[PDB]
Chain A
Amino acid sequence: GIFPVACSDGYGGLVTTDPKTADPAYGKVFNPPRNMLPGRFTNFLDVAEACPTFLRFEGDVPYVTTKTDSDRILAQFDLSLAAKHMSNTFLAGLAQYYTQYSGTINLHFMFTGPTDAKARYMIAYAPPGMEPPKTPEAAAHCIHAEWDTGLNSKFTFSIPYLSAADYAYTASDTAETTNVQGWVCLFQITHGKADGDALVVLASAGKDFELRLPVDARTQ
């Protein structure tokens, strides 16, 4: 006779993400040539590394001005892709479609004031477990880097990926481990006649930044 086959139950339903191709309906079409077009990108994280985008601060500006008082905290925000400061970066607009990440986030700090304005800054990483620091002297016991302005006007610091698990969530739910990865605290050590300057700050992905498990929550 013919070949016996057992049509199994639970198989063959449409799955919107199955590794199967549809049946052809129309054949032998040749595309117009498109080899060597400018601007090809194959991976979304290749563009997130070669192209930093601005952060967002109080008043909706990409810069933080040099304050002259007993306070020296410029920015201090949750190390979270869902943070408010990160909300307009390409790295956080691309991470909203994934549930977990891993690796390093780079922050680019470009100083803008005139040639006679001078300042010294400090960026630290407060891991989760206790409150974040409020002065630079208390934050000097963290992982920090300190730079000052000169001929070279940009400094780049890599937020280290410390965590208990290998992956962390890109969303945030409640006060919980995976959604608070600590803080990142920007201080101003000194300044000389730098009143009202701007320190524009960018952000991008590190060498080992990773982002996996696609998802579709909402709101492009």
Chain B
Amino acid sequence: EETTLLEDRILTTRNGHTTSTTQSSVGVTYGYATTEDFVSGPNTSGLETRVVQAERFFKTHLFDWVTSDSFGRCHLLELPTDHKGVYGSLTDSYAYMRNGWDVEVTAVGNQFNGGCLLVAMVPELCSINKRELYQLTLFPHQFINPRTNMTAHITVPFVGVNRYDQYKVHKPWTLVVMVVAPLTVNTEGAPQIKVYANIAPTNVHVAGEFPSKE
């Protein structure tokens, strides 16, 4: 990385016409697959289309990581979320969609904080338990350790029992951000720290256009 406490591991990510640069990077984690599987299937009759305008970052707030929060504090974000972009006008236009996710979580507090976050992409998260949090690293994850990084970048494909999904009744992925070591504000640490997500869908394919009251 660098010889001193100062840190230079530059990583840039362009989704569409939107970029995102990080200088405290650990690398991108690929989960369960590096590429996609077969988009064209026997269930859409070749009427699937790729919409390239929908593949770009959108931002959202997760939670405040304060010193009083102890091990096991979760924040669950079900994907796809309520989106006001062009990706949102796809769940009102089309009946079936499929896409992967490009998730980048940020927690900025200076390197004089302790504590550790574990951000993980969990498929089909119907229920989590207190003991199951000990095995949360079975999923695509990265740690956010304020002495080393502020960013965790996790790319992940489409998973499901079906090849296309009906996102209005099914949320396949879930972004869970867990406190594994509570925050510390020692003498020079930032008092609290806000956690943000910078998500972007990838390889979005749609099929079956619904009628319009417009």
Cα distance, A219 to B82, chains bound together (Å): 40
B residues less than 8 Å from A19 (CB atoms)? none
Query: Judging by beta carbons under 8 Å apart, are B148 and A38 in contact?
Result: no
CB-nearest residue of chain A to B116: A112
Q: Mark B10-45 against chain A: 1 for CB-CB distance below 8 A, else 0.
A: 000000000000000000000111000110011000
- Pick out which of these stretches binds chain A: B52-60, B107-115, B198-206: B107-115
Decide if A36 touches B180 in the complex (CB within 8 Å). no
Indicate if B95 sits at the interface (CB-CB under 8 A).
Answer: no
User: What residues of chain A lie closer than 8 Å to B134, measured between beta carbons?
Assistant: 53-54, 56, 62, 88-89
Q: A33-B42, A63-B180, A114-B189 are in contact. Are A54 and B137 (CB under 8 A)?
A: yes
Cβ of A205 to closest chain B Cβ, rounded Å: 13
How many inter-chain contacts with C-beta < 8 Å in the A-B complex?
Answer: 99
- CB 8 Å contact bits of A47-85 with B (1 = contact, 0 = none): 100011110100011110000000000000000000000
CB within 8 Å of A: which B126-150 residues: 131, 134-138, 143, 145-148
B192 within 8 A of partner (CB)? no
A118 to chain B, nearest CB (A): 11
What residues of A have a CB within 8 angstroms of the CB of B148 in the complex?
153
B159 CB–A CB distance under 8 Å: yes
Which residue from chain B places its CB closest to the CB of A196 in the assembled complex?
Answer: B184
A63 / chain B contacts, CB cutoff of 8 Å:
71, 180-181
Residues of chain B with a CB closer than 8 A to A61's CB: 70-71
Contact with A along B150-189 (1 / 0, CB 8 A): 0000000111000000000000000000001110101001
Chain B binding surface, main DSSP class: loop
A38-B157, A56-B134, A89-B134 as given contacts; A115 in contact with B71, CB under 8 Å? no
| Bound CA span A69–B157, Å | 50
Cross-chain contact A36 with B37 (CB below 8 angstroms): yes
| Chain A proximity of B120: nearest CB distance (Å) | 11
Task: Report yes or no: A114 in contact with B112, Cβ–Cβ below 8 A.
Answer: yes
**Complex CA–CA separation, A88 to B180 (angstroms):** 14
Give the residue of B33, B42, B116, B135 whose beta carbon is less than 8 angstroms from that of A89.
B135
Residue A37 is within 8 A (CB to CB) of chain B in the complex: yes
Answer whether A200 and B180 are a contact pair too, CB < 8 Å, given A90-B138, A112-B116.
yes
Residues of A within 8 A of B (CB): 32-33, 35-39, 47, 51-54, 56, 60-63, 88-90, 93, 110, 112-117, 151, 153, 196-198, 200, 202
